[PDB]
Design an enzyme around this catalytic site. Structure first.
Site: not given
Ligand SMILES: COc1cc(-c2cnc(N)c(N3CCC(C(=O)O)CC3)n2)cc(OC)c1OC
Ligand SMILES: [Cl-]
Ligand SMILES: [Cl-]
Ligand SMILES: [Cl-]
Ligand SMILES: [Cl-]
Length: 250
Positions: A13-14, A15, A32, A128
């Site tokens: 996934g897209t 830092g 990451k 979170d």
């Protein structure tokens, strides 16, 4: 220790988040990418503090953060961690919606068990708690990870008025387990003000009937308006629903 020791396979996934292979042994991991190039020194000192805290989190139900790498010429920080082939809970839930198919109670029990133990460890050490921050490995294990705009579906009645409160985490877990079951949050609305109104009335549909009264009851307790009526992590784990096989296994 050096980015050269690893080969990027591809971006997750897209830092950016990337699947990587350690050259020395062929070990599969991810890292990451954090670009600290536009950060101040005070922000970097902050970032260092946070990264040392991640290194200290060792728990089967928390994403294991192995290493950190600095590439000075790219102003890029790499956090190396375990690979969780199962992806996140968000995608699982969206998959359920499309497939028009509810998730197994056994699966919900696993998430409840393993996330509660994750939370229990976080409290002992003193983030979170949403589907996009919960990950699955290749062995049915559940791991908490990632330590405006959009509505705060999971915002507890205390956090609405005013956390820090460990019972506030229980409410968030209740919201998450509820959304796993019904494939939708317990409280929906078009505005945060409408949402707050719904949250304060404390009313919601029962999770679907395929799920036991026992599962429905514990999730319902977690969604109590009064933080002191929600079960503690210990009272949760004491529930007759939760068995050994719901826990992590290497
Ligand atoms: C294979 O499909 C997917 C995998 C992941 C994935 C796998 N392993 C991880 N360690 C990981 N990280 C990324 C972010 C972390 C952080 O914020 O600290 C913790 C977990 N992610 C992710 C996928 O999409 C979200 C995915 O496709 C659904
Ligand atoms: Cl594990
Ligand atoms: Cl459905
Ligand atoms: Cl009520
Ligand atoms: Cl229903």
């Amino acid at each position: 220790s050096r980015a050269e020791d690893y080969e990027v396979l591809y971006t997750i996934g897209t830092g950016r988040c990337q699947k990587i292979r350690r050259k020395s042994d062929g070990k599969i991991l991810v890292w990451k990418e954090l670009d600290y190039g536009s950060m101040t020194e005070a922000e970097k000192q902050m970032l260092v503090s946070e990264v040392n805290l991640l290194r200290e989190l060792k728990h089967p139900n928390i994403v294991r953060y192995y290493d950190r790498i600095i590439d000075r010429t790219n102003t890029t920080l790499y956090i190396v961690m375990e690979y969780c082939e199962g992806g996140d809970l968000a995608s699982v839930i969206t998959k359920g919606t499309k497939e028009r198919q509810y998730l197994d109670e056994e699966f919900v029990l696993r998430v409840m068990t393993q996330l509660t133990l994750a939370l229990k460890e976080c409290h002992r050490r003193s983030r979170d708690l949403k589907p996009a921050n919960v990950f699955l490995d290749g062995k049915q294990n559940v791991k908490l990870g990632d330590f405006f705009v959009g509505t705060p579906y999971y915002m507890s009645p205390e956090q609405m008025n005013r956390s820090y409160n460990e019972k506030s985490d229980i409410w968030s877990l209740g919201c998450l387990l509820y959304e796993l079951c019904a494939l939708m949050p317990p409280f929906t609305a078009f505005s945060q003000k409408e949402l707050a109104g719904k949250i304060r009335e404390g009313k919601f549909r029962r999770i679907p009937y395929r799920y036991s009264d026992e599962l429905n009851e514990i999730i319902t307790r977690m969604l109590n308006l009064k933080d002191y009526h929600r079960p503690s992590v210990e009272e949760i784990l004491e529930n007759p629903l939760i068995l050994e096989h719901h826990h992590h296994h290497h």
